[PDB]
Amino acid sequence: DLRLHLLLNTSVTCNDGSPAGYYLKESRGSRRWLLFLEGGWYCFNRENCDSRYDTMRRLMSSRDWPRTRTGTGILSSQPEENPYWWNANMVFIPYCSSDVWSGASSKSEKNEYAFMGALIIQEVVRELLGRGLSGAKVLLLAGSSAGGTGVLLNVDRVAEQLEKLGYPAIQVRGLADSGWFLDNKQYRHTDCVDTCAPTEAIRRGIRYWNGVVPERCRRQFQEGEEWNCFFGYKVYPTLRSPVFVVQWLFDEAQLTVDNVHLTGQPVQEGLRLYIQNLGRELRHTLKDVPASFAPACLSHEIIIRSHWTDVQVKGTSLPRALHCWDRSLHDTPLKGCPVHLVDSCPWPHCNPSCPTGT
Ligand SMILES: *[C@@H]1O[C@H](CO)[C@@H](O)[C@H](O)[C@H]1NC(C)=O
Ligand SMILES: O=C1CC[C@@H]2Cc3ccccc3N12
């Protein structure tokens, strides 16, 4: 159980102006800190944000947040469920800014909603320093789905923040789960009334949120093209902090934005080739990502699932791969302790350890 703390700086808010916050479970005499970013899509204009406020309000507001949450998967404190970091200080940061953790805009006369995801992360880090983060040796910024993309957008800013605050000894690293998306062609193509492909949706989102992206990526793509930095394979090479990338080869959210709706009906040749080419393109974008875990499964998110230990690539689980990553970052590859684990087989569930969906 992680306990809720609403941000003392009440200028840093969820979409509706309620204070943002974080759930914390301390582990004294651990110098490891895990800050996890929740996911859950985004909204990018007044109408679809209003709709999200009606039926996904916990993703836009802290008014109804429970005072505790149970840590699961990598946020679990039992070794049985979390072989990797069970003894770490655990932080769960609710996603209530609907901006892929990129926003830096307050609710005001001109803005019905606040989009402060980038400032929320910075304020959580700042307020944690007085609760023991000042003594940290590693801060792993992790996240799933939109939170995984949020890791990529924010990990170097957390590193810069701690350096400017006087804590250059804290090693900041990133763990991006299910946030590595492709701006590929859709299987069936809509224009953009709502139908809005992620590239166009993000482009409008950045203007609506006052979204911010990592500085080196911003300098490459420049004014008007920042939406590019929301795509993992474009932003990752600009990053300096070590980042472990977890991505299903056949991610369900990727297939959704590709207008692929798998029906149980038989898969025709056109769709078969589309799905196989998606897996191949994902694999290709991970070729030069040394720390990665990419199983050939049709699924979405891994790291806060209670059975996240079950999936294996080439016989190595994700908790083991992350442990090997830890060893590789000690101050040359490790015998039998791999960190680059990308499936090569070409169809969902060709890996027998894939989640069953049960
Ligand atoms: C609260 O957060 C805002 C946004 O980051 C910042 O400008 C302001 O200085 C903060 N206030 C305090 C008292 O730290
Ligand atoms: O989070 C999510 C849900 C799936 C979409 C695709 C995408 C591209 C860039 C950033 C975020 C997201 N998506």
**Residues flanking ligand 1, CB < 6 Å:** 9, 11-12, 119, 123
Length of the chain: 358
Among protein residues, the one with the nearest Cα to ligand 1's atom 12 is: 9
Q: How far apart are CA 125 and CA 91, in angstroms?
A: 10
Experimental method for this entry?
X-ray
Residue 228, phi then psi, degrees to nearest 5:
-60, -30
Closest C-alpha to 296, from 325, 310, 276, 316:
276
| Dihedral over Cα of 33, 39, 45, 49: its sign | negative
Q: Is 148 in the pocket of ligand 2 (CB under 6 A)?
A: no
Please tell me the distance between residue 352's alpha carbon and the centre of ligand 2 in angstroms.
27
Please tell me the distance between residue 119's alpha carbon and the centre of ligand 1 in angstroms.
9
Tell me, in Å, the resolution of the deposited structure: 1.7
Q: How far apart are CA 85 and CA 77, in angstroms?
A: 8
The answer to whether 253 and 205 have CB atoms below 8 angstroms apart is no
Ligand number nearest CA of 103 is: 1
Q: How far apart are CA 263 and CA 58, in angstroms?
A: 30
The answer to whether 304 and 81 have CB atoms below 8 angstroms apart is no
Q: Residue 168 corresponds to which tokens in the numbers above?
A: 């250059």
Q: Is 178 in the pocket of ligand 2 (CB under 6 A)?
A: no
- Who's near 346: CB < 8 A, 6+ residues apart? 276, 279, 280, 296
What atom of ligand 1 comes closest to residue 126's alpha carbon? 14
DSSP state of 226: G
Run of H or E including 296: none
Please tell me the distance between residue 162's alpha carbon and the centre of ligand 2 in angstroms.
28
Secondary structure in 3-state letters for 82-124: CCCCCCCEEEEECCCCCCCCCCCECCCCCCCCCECHHHHHHHH
Q: Is 202 in the pocket of ligand 2 (CB under 6 A)?
A: yes
Give me the long-range contacts of 204-208 (CB less than 8 A, separation at least 24). Answer: 204/44, 204/45, 205/42, 205/43, 205/44, 205/99, 205/100, 205/102, 206/102, 208/44, 208/45, 208/115
Q: How far apart are CA 257 and CA 241, in angstroms?
A: 29
- Rounded to 10 degrees, what is the CA torsion of 64, 66, 71, 75? 50
Query: How many Cβ atoms sit within 10 Å of the Cβ of residue 147?
Result: 29
Q: How far apart are CA 244 and CA 173, in angstroms?
A: 8
Q: Is 144 in the pocket of ligand 2 (CB under 6 A)?
A: no
Closest C-alpha to 102, from 209, 216, 220, 227:
209
Residue numbers after which the chain breaks, C to N beyond 2.5 angstroms: 194, 331
Q: Where are the domains of the chain?
A: 1-358
